[model samples]
Target chain A: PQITLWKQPLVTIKIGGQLKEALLDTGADDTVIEEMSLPGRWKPKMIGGIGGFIKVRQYDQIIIEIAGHKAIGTVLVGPTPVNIIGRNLLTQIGATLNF
Target chain B: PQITLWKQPLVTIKIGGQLKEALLDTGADDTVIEEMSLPGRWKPKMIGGIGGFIKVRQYDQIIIEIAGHKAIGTVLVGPTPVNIIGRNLLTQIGATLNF
Candidate 1:
């Protein structure tokens, strides 16, 4: 699937069997999701974003679909201002910044 | 030129004859830079990020070189948490979010 940067680079995605909107945040190192329970083994972690740092649950072996591109990676769930699809999953889907 | 997401997607760019680092922000609507004086007609504007909106000086018809790819677009200068190269400029340079 291809995304045209018409206005905002907003992409539709599915994570944990729930449809959601996520910002394809290339600036972020890892994906940050809103607090929702997904079946996976998780460990304590911390990630910093626009405002400051926050504690997150690093869940491994999670599968997410972005514009029909399937990717399995680590997801961090925490209280976030927004849902972000970081470089981790973007790399798997061959996401490119093109004119 | 391609950027591998080894860490944060930080890219080196030449703007106003000064070399600097900026985040290739796929989430941002417009590019935001730190306070600097560029020779261009500017207007007052406001942009928001993770935290809140901030006032900026919008400069038009600015030429910026990123990894040898040149892009001419609008750039806003203000007090930001980080230097961001948004989709407006990224599209000019064919920047990608590929894995």
Candidate 2:
């Protein structure tokens, strides 16, 4: 039996002074950053999504350099267990995930 | 400083319905609800805050009944909009917020 491998390019983010790598997931609609763990002046904001509208304050817009490619977008503020690299930013750079 | 009268006895909450009241502010750290219109279910748990420690998730336990007092806790599914009535809920089995 042979093992199959499926992997995608990972992006690195600095949270709580710690640099962590994350996967780029296109299925996710928004980029989520764990709250209280962020490193700057990020606040909440009212957001409107396909499900309607919700107020979700966010802060910061950093350039994410992936595989030597870069893209800029807003970072969300919240207490999510993990960070999600969503489609909003990936589409602009014409990138897709592997697994 | 000769004319002063304090009013406090308004406890009504009915969003997406019709019932609003205001009164009650005890200078202290307590419950504060304000996110997505809620209805049905009432959950409970511990939430973390302050300088450090992860921000935890806690379910809300509600029991309202005053023309439009709905209460019960739910697992905050997601995509919340707006619906909060902080503090006043606990202050005294005891009502607060009426002006």
Candidate 3:
């Protein structure tokens, strides 16, 4: 799939058997989702970006379906403006930046 | 050029007659470079992300050479961990997300 950068690269993602919209963010180093309930144990973690830092629940080896592509990695649940699938998961799905 | 997500999508950019390394960030709404001196009348602005918001100086219609591709758009100068070239300028250079 080739997505133009003219608009937000929003796509449908399936997590915990629920469908949600997420942005493919090349800027972010880790994948972060809006606060939600998920099974299994998770650890409290902090992630920083352009702004500063935010604490989140880190769930490791979680399975996520992005645009029908499967990827398993650390999923952070936190307070975020939007659901962002960052480089951590993007690379698992072989996503790339092209010009 | 096609960039793999395995590593940070850092690129060399020529701005204000100086060369700098910047990340091609799809998640960022606007390009934010590390605090620097650029000749212009910039407006005070604020931008937010996953964590919080930060104050920055917005310079509009700025010309940037990204990976040898020319782009002109709003470039923000602020206190950031690293230089980021966001979607605002990425579109001008025909950058896209592909898998």
Candidate 4:
């Protein structure tokens, strides 16, 4: 399957039983979600970004959907301005950088 | 062709006679480079991210290479923490989001 790239390559995704728009960030290795309630065992970790650093809750076995394709992987929930779907989960969906 | 995704999906590129590493960021709409000296003409533009906005010099008719793939498009130079190869030129290289 193929995905289109717009200004941000923004897409609709389903996670935690809610539909949300997220950025498919090939630039990132892990998926980061905007602050939300995630029920499960989580490990807190710190990540660096353009501006500064932010700590996130790492949750495993999280399932997500993109364009009807299902993927399961580690999800990081934190105080982020936008929801970023990174390669950690994108691979599970067979997503690739192609030409 | 397909490209691999790592934590950062970083790749070496040639620009302004310099070899530099950049993130293949599908999340970004325009290619942004860490502050550097670029020869040619440019326009000033403002872009927003998680934190705020940054002024960038947008150079038209610029050239770049990724994994031996050649691309010519607009290149933006700014004081960015990391070099990001955005969609504005990724498309010119025939890069796509695939599964």
Interface RMSD of each: 3.0, 24.7, 1.0, 2.0
Q: How many Å off is the CA of B79 in candidate 4?
A: 2.7
* DockQ, structure candidate 2: 0.01
Per-candidate Cα RMSD to the true structure, in Å, reads: 2.9, 18.2, 1.1, 2.2
Q: Which ten residues in a row have the lowest lDDT in candidate 4 chain A?
A: A1-10
Give the per-residue lDDT of model 4 (tens digit) for A1-99. Answer: 577665567789999998999998897778999888776899998775555567889999998997688998889988777899989888777778887
Give the candidate order by descending TM-score.
3, 4, 1, 2
lDDT of each: 0.80, 0.40, 0.92, 0.82
Candidate 2 residue lDDT tens string, A1-99: 111112232557554445666544333455665554444576666543223444455766655554345667766655444456555565555542111
Model 2, B1-99: lDDT tens digits are 011111222346544354544222221123333343555554443432211222223445544433243444322223222222333332323322111
DockQ of prediction 1:
0.43
How are the candidates ranked when ordered by DockQ, highest leading? 3, 4, 1, 2
| Candidate 1 C-alpha lDDT tens digits along B30-72 | 8889999899588999775554467889999898987677988
TM-score, cand. 1 vs. native: 0.80
Score chain A of each prediction against the true chain A by TM-score and list the results.
Answer: 0.90, 0.56, 0.96, 0.91
TM-score of chain A, predicted model 4, versus the true chain A, to 2 decimals = 0.91
**What TM-score did chain B of candidate 3 earn?**
0.95
Best-matching candidate per lDDT: 3
Q: Write the per-residue lDDT of candidate 4 for residues B1-99, one digit (tens) a residue.
A: 677674557788999878999988998888999888877878998876654577889998887887678888888888777999889878777777887
* Candidate rank order under lDDT: 3, 4, 1, 2
For every prediction, compared with the true complex, DockQ reads 0.43, 0.01, 0.83, 0.61
